[PDB]
Amino acid sequence: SKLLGVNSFALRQFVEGYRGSYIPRMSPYEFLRNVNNYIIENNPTLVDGYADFCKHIFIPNFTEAKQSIVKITNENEKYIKTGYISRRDEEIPVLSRWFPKDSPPASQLIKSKYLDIILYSKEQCEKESSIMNCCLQDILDDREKNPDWYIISIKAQNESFEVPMEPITILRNTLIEEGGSGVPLKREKYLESVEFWKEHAIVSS
Amino acid sequence: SKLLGVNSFALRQFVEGYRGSYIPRMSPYEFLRNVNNYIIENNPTLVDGYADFCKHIFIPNFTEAKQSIVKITNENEKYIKTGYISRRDEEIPVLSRWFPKDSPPASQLIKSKYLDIILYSKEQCEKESSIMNCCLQDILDDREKNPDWYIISIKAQNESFEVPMEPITILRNTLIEEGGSGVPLKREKYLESVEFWKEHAIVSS
């Protein structure tokens, strides 16, 4: 509401090798028009996220972005990679596990059914930008020069509901400086997240 | 001078399956006796730790405790296990990686050269215990029923200086409720620990 913008954080997902939902063969700008059209044409439901500043829409996947999370099994565990990875240069690296794009669990995957489009308020985006401050430029729809909400993340998934965020994401959100949305840890949310992520991994690239 | 105690947190290291430095076939009291007898005989240097409430003593290893950390290489990385484990019952679980006791990296290891004996102030132990509500018994030397300093951790290691704590531990130290000692995160301390723990994993049990 009104139409959307794209926050500069999301721009990492249009670059091959992204650890999660890689959106291929389309520009961020072309990605934003299409999402915005969906909105104009279908008036989707704006869904509460984990805090007041965070919303979600779920849309059919109009991209060739593939399923990016797979269940970990006895059979496929041997393909887990591990390492200390940053989301971006400004952040400290975090202990992270994933299936590599080259591995058996990732060779099967096809286009995901939906897209979970994660939105931050204008205010929250500004708040974090006045702490870390990246001099990167957001991508605006020519139809909307001052959007109230920005796309910060895109999850390519077969569920049309919110999948829990990784437990380290939750832990980092405790530290705006490092940053960090700036929300206190809620034990119950953290433990829900852990129960999901004990048996799932992100697929790289 | 005074002599030391054992904080209840350190008791977990005398149980086989400990994730790190397992002290074998010796009671915590017999451990503390020998440590205090070394203090009286040898006047060891009390070395500052990461915070004012934390010190170390580095002692020749008088136990059969084995080297508990191994350099990760391209040929042993296949033996890494991953998972969400808690340090104790009241802690939330955290993403971890290790070499299992059975793995080829762990079959070669022998008695370590030194012990790093990590101390917390009486004050700090009190402060954390009153935030977490714990109910384990501290181990006291008959010779010192009111120590100024308590053994919280024992590292069985081959160098006579402080090895960086895991990144996890530094992040949890920002939350005393989780806890947590706790201390605002130092970017540069954190990054120093990442550069070590990139190439190193604990050996279990």
Automatic annotation (TrEMBL), chains A, B:
**What organism is this sequence from?**
Cryptosporidium parvum (strain Iowa II)
PANTHER family for the chain: FLAGELLAR ASSOCIATED PROTEIN, PTHR38666
Organism placement in taxonomy? Eukaryota, Sar, Alveolata, Apicomplexa, Conoidasida
- Recorded protein name is Uncharacterized protein
Q: Name one Pfam family in it.
A: DUF3228
